[model samples]
Target chain A: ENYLDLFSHKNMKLKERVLIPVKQYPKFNFVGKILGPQGNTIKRLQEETGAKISVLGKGSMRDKAKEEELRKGGDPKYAHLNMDLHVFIEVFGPPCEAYALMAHAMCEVKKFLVPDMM
Target chain B: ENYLDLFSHKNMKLKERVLIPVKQYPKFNFVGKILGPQGNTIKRLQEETGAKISVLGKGSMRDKAKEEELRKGGDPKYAHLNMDLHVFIEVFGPPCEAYALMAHAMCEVKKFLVPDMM
Candidate 1:
């Protein structure tokens, strides 16, 4: 039988709400040039949010192998301003309820960096 | 009528059960060293997610004023890792529904970054 044929059976509750589910992942990229050097913007963010920010770089790595590569730091070919900063903004609760707040925080950060309203 | 008084009328029947509300957000920051200088990780992420990630830097600015300053040259004093990477993760639907999947995708990325688990 066709794969979709299974849905045609009377046992299938056609009248019921058909839940077509999906998953989403959001990732954005900002230029290090725009944010400034040595994490000045990150420091500004920490000041605004009053949250502690950590730099997960070569010095802080627990993994010996990955740390080795990071030791030879400042490789422009390797440093692409991507994954360079993973911000951990701690809040109260789990993913099920945190997204709304996450959206607000992200929007606020954007506002601070680019005040221009569109 | 008082703002809260509106909730005090007979319409405010003592519900048989209690109902509470809450919200939350999640952010993580990583050192520029771990992600490398060239945004290799972000490039990999772009490939995996099939999402176009652009670096919104000084050069991309439509604002003539900001563009002039950015064109001058790199400023270590200005370059920071804070909002340097703004990831715009595209999904199939609205924020409310898309969040569920966002959580999963984020989790997957973490798994890739740090395979070691507790």
Candidate 2:
């Protein structure tokens, strides 16, 4: 049937990467939650999605000081204090597989990082 | 003065990265323009932004066939034919510097890749 004929060609290999920056610096305790006990959360994600994931740019004392100043100045966004942390996710393999992995990775990160809100 | 007090702390080291995907599969010829003569354009961008940039997943025969099928099917967006080529840009260093580099790199890529439109 023509419908079945749609699968004629071999799937093309696909590779893609995405970077997401946390707008507010999350506290170290919150970050630890995302990392899970001994980074098992990240490891599970990598295995499930077949993607390489990394977290970079830990917060420093200076970041906390700046956050405090902003809070004192009545910046509501800074009231809770945040730091700069970036996440990188890269996927390789079949197009559908890679896309699926990325979507899952994004969902997992959002859920883990903002479990309180969501 | 208090105005100068803003610069008291040693700037917290900042490292960030960004990944930008080309919405459409850019023709090899167009990609060549982005790369410039012997990749001088990309080299210059890397030097200026202090970011590592890479182009991955070149178009394959299956990709071309798929694009052609889409074009023939009267998809206006695909009428011109586009391939799947993804670009990855990663920045590292001071926060301000990294942010600045990413912004500039994006502008350069947009300019070179879509000169006719923009």
Candidate 3:
């Protein structure tokens, strides 16, 4: 339980959250682009922010990209590159650091989170 | 200059710009991240707005393995992403509509357009 102290140490932890805006917005198909062809994009984001990021909900993640439906009613093929969706990009750290990390991580995630321009 | 009408005709063309502040971020591989595999990232972003993207500077999409230098090139303290500079991301379309593409692009590329959570 040595490392346990690190995560559970009272108010020392960042109980606050960088809630997934998409989890809030429910927009269609962006996780792939945000994750970047297999998580490359997000890895860069996590690295830059110095935050521990985890993907929650939207499947166990063990479940490979759900068979693919391609965002319809639009030029699905051309409008956007990803065929994915709704999940949390949970990030965490110490209270002081985590908030800034939240900002950095949030800023980066936002880039791909938008309407390709709707 | 007959084809000049393509850009000159009444205002059919746009040269809106989104910029990459690679120097400001101090993180490595952002250019690579945003550009993505063989530049697929930008390719998709462009397809969305029907705007054309032209990347200029910060090696002008010419270098690979730049991230490697970002780490080992200087202090492994992970502060600087090395001697990078700003790059222009141009979105050419109808001027008014051209705006969306740039805003989207800029928000995505910037590590923190909004202030970090204090």
Candidate 4:
């Protein structure tokens, strides 16, 4: 039915998502580092890339123990652990822009939180 | 070493790649349609998504046979067959943008080439 011709006239706008897997879960405190103090890092990432970014997955028992340590004046670096987590980045714009934004966020997460993991 | 602090100070620029698998192979003619006449569709896609797109995998005997038929005035829709192919989309910009571009390209292929395959 010549759908291609039809699509040619249209812009074919669409929304998409990319789930970047965290192969080796990073320390929970490192998650905080990625998010930055007061969530500023994630906030800036959202603003700069124009994509909604969120961390997913459950925390491990190690995370709880680390949190307890941090509460007791332990080093922030030992705050907790992310046993299994993934970063879900979504973009709703031109395909190129969305991909760019997601890729940027992924690099930022890898560079800041789990450089060794990637 | 507080790499997070260092990354925070910098923009943390990086590039990433996404490889989308084609679960089920589609007819070779479908690929042409997705690419559009004279590669116009693929060109437009590159311009729109800002990602380099390429179809991978070799043609099968069925594909070659179908091509012979196509050259002999067979249905253009039966051009050939893609037995095992994957689309590789690469983005050298922001993470979000790269992911978005890859996702969009994946969707476009699914929507146009293998709607039933997805």
lDDT ranking, best first: 4, 2, 3, 1
Error of 4 at A107 (Å): 2.5
- Off by more than 4 A, model 3: A1-118, B1-9, B12-19, B62-84, B92-95, B111-118
Tell me each candidate's i-RMS in Å. 16.7, 17.3, 19.7, 11.4
What is candidate 3's lDDT per residue for B9-66, written digit by digit as tens? 3543323233344444455555566567988877886676454555543454445466
Q: Write the per-residue lDDT of candidate 2 for residues A24-92, one digit (tens) a residue.
A: 333435456656678887788778756677654333223656656776797664433442444555655
TM-score-based ranking, best first?
4, 2, 3, 1
Model 3 lDDT, residue B9, Cα? 34
Clashing residue pairs in candidate 2 (N, C-alpha, C atoms within 3 angstroms) = A25-A82, A25-A83, B25-B83
lDDT of each: 0.34, 0.47, 0.43, 0.47
The C-alpha stretches of model 1 lying farther than 4 A from their native spots are A1-93, A96-118, B1-37, B50-68, B71-88, B93-101, B108-117
lDDT of 4 at A88: 51
After superposition on all C-alphas, the RMSD of every candidate to the true structure, in Å, is 28.2, 18.9, 20.8, 11.9
Top candidate (lDDT): 4
Candidate 4: lDDT of A81? 30
Model 2 residue runs over 4 Å out of place are A1-28, A60-83, B1-118
User: What are the per-model numbers of colliding residue pairs?
Assistant: 46, 3, 1, 26
Candidate of highest DockQ: 4
